[PDB]
């Protein structure tokens, strides 16, 4: 989360995102998607 926040904040001034930034964001959010799916699984059953 902190790394994606820093990446976005660097790209905030440049409204147009380069293709390298786009693919880097895509692989980062794929990793984040897998981590989020891992968390769902950790709590998908009603495990208190």
């Amino acid at each position: 989360q902190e790394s994606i926040s820093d990446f976005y904040w660097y790209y905030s001034g440049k409204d147009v995102i380069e293709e390298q930034g786009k693919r880097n964001f895509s692989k980062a959010m794929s990793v984040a998607k897998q981590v989020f799916n891992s968390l769902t699984e950790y709590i998908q059953g009603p495990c208190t």
Binding site: S5, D6, W9, G13
Partner: protein, 134 residues
């Protein structure tokens, strides 16, 4: 536990082991007049009272470093190690800053820290760092 946030008046303190004693002192400054910050003893309060009207620094703004460089180009947020902050004197209402005047003679590279009339540039902003390894 008790993580400091934005808009919290804070005194900055440190310690010195001179003469086998624990000062536990804190910095202060009289903004109208001697702008540069001077350390003020805090120990022996029962002996002499310490002046605490010039020790209050309110954390007006707290924000990351990448946000800092963006905001430079341009409620109570908890401070995190590595983030930037904007301390401001209470009586003086002037922001704490690293004055470029190299008053110090001992350390040739030591810019004397003082008070800036307006929070402009990177001079007023300050960044914390975790001293403990934990």
């Amino acid at each position: 536990v008790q993580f400091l946030r934005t808009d919290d008046e804070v005194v900055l303190q440190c310690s010195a082991t001179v003469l086998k004693e624990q000062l536990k002192l804190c910095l202060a400054a009289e903004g109208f007049g001697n702008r540069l910050c001077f350390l003020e003893p805090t120990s022996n309060a029962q002996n002499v009272p310490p002046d605490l009207a010039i020790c209050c620094f309110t954390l007006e703004q707290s924000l990351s470093v990448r946000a800092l460089q963006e905001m430079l180009a341009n409620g109570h947020r908890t401070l995190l190690y590595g983030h930037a902050i904007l301390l401001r004197h209470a009586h003086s209402r002037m922001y704490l800053s690293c004055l470029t005047t190299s008053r110090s003679m001992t350390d040739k590279l030591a810019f004397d820290v003082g008070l800036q009339e307006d929070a402009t540039g990177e001079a007023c902003w300050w960044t914390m760092h975790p001293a403990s390894k934990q």
